[PDB]
Design a protein around this nucleic acid. Structure first.
Lengths: 129, 129, 129, 129, 129, 129
RNA sequence: CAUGAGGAUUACCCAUG
RNA sequence: CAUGAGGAUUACCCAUG
RNA sequence: CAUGAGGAUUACCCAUG
RNA sequence: CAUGAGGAUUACCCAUG
């Protein structure tokens, strides 16, 4: 095995899909980027540290760019109009078994499933009410 | 479209599903909890705010109980040994349209989809390798 | 020849064998763990470096769980009462050829072979007498 | 009994084998050396101490020499071109039973068994990858 | 997936090839070493960093040894009579797409192709004329 | 005889090849430039010197431009949006025979051969992982 | 005592606590 | 290290402890 | 951080900004 | 002259020895 593989970050039914690939592992931070110029690429990073004697902490970061072409000094450069940032920290006690961890993954997947509250609010630019 | 409703957090295909229901709305912070004591419950909270002039920011927190060898309704100490904490922060520039936000949600879904690196690592008590 | 693979750490002759698999590669430090919660897992880590101008140095660490009266998947405190730690450091002068290094490995195997003093003492909760 | 006996440190199928014999027990440090001049001998030392109220620690040291003949002041002396050093510390909780300790010995033997990752890297002068 | 793997540095048909294998990846610096005595080995290191707001910079190093045996006082050691050192720095703006980077790589390969001015000068202990 | 000649820097089959031609050889620094606007041209420079009593040192530079058109006040000029810079220094002891130098050249070609770690990382806007 | 993928000419030494 | 419905141009920074 | 056809025993060292 | 995973608009510039 080796879980450091490329994957589809944004699924648009096989066409216009955004896949992200392994690009760096320096300093214990695993990185993935899309096939773009570093200035217009999607970025995903992940790292795990035993933050305490009895805790392990995963730090995950995702960057979604709004691509654009900008004219600087009368020349066109590929760039990002702006970026959206997702920063998440997951603290798991060392006593958690593999099945305990699978439970955490399922909860995170159910949290963001289409039709549920949170993803519905985010997609509609509103709060929860 | 009131979105503050009950939803399935952990989907075990109909049998053994974990449902989470509205439990508090103090200060604009929406809360959902499972039908358990608060020490063993699945908890979800969410709120939105204008973090700065350029950004809006969603803060989402999730608490997942350690289930293996758990004593239902019992007093389990220390608390830190029996709970996992998920802390998510999503920063979105004010220029993002509903379409842009839909894509951001898809990116979060893709990140955690089954078989992908991050969820596979977490579920196996591993890092990236 | 990629050598970062799964291997049998504790050989109980086919039945009850403990296998250890790649679980992390952050910072050049390779890690292997058994299929357990991290509090009860068998862990192995290894790294190499040029300690000085004259030597190269391998740092190998092993963590072995206390199994007698163990509650699988449970919270066992204090941590120090349920785990044994092995810390190995191998210093090798830069002049050592593959042949020299093979002999060093044989010396380590001979040191721990069944029936020999050191392993017999450790297994019997004894010292030398 | 008495586990303070000679043993084969390096096994080359009964011919060219390096056996090591008890040579000193002063100050609670058990020592073994090969039949050589003190300057060209293999050396093994072992000691156990109750390092804490609830821990016992084994300190083991092995020295593998690269033998050579050196001319000093126009005279030939038996000496060591260089030496390889193995230093290991094993911390075992006092609650470990004899079977718990046998588990530690087996893990150390499996760790160094021919064909496995670590001994393969060391013998090939490389890291783990 | 992984590019921190073993590879052929010097290609002498199929036999006499110099292969370099991963050895260490500490502090964002990946290192590869050829087999046998570290003192007579080929070395390759590589790293990337954000040198400035718009630039990423690669630092690559190669060491080619002149294998020889040292004899002092009748003691002979495997050493490097001397070493040839290669140090290269490649700066690439963040606006470069994958296509641009591929072009940069072709330029480097073209610069060193057999028969061209530069590799010809070096191979003949010469300069330009 | 002469090695200060025209040569192919970038090989794109037979058509679209980037050729670089001699332009100047002042102060021991040989320079090659591709055709058309100097502002959009590829540049290669090379020089050798006795860096010390025992060493000779080659300094080589390559510049890869990103061709673009600049427009200011309705006036358009051919320019380079940006440039990628390569700087390499090769030190070779005066004891190196022609055979040794040929080996050094093969090492450089091997380092950059298609499919190998380094050229692969660069071509993909990546680091080592 | 303890911790260090801290060093050594290897039962010594260094740093932090 | 830890905590923040603390900030960011996002592996950085701030406050409290 | 940046520059040097600056030097090295090559992830160190120097000069200038 | 030498070193720097020091920076650049790349035969210039900086820090240290």
């Amino acid at each position: 095995a080796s879980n450091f593989t490329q994957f589809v970050l944004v699924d648009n039914g096989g066409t216009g899909d955004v896949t992200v690939a392994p690009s760096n592992f320096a300093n214990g931070v695993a990185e993935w980027i899309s096939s773009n110029s570093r200035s217009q690429a999607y970025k995903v990073t992940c790292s795990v540290r035993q933050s305490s004697a009895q805790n392990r902490k995963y730090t995950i970061k995702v960057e979604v760019p709004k691509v654009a072409t900008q004219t600087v000094g009368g020349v066109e450069l590929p760039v990002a109009a702006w970026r959206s940032y997702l920063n998440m920290e997951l603290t798991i006690p060392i006593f958690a078994t593999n099945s305990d961890c699978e439970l955490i993954v399922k909860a995170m997947q159910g949290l963001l499933k289409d039709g549920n509250p949170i993803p519905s609010a985010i997609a509609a630019n509103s709060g929860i009410y």
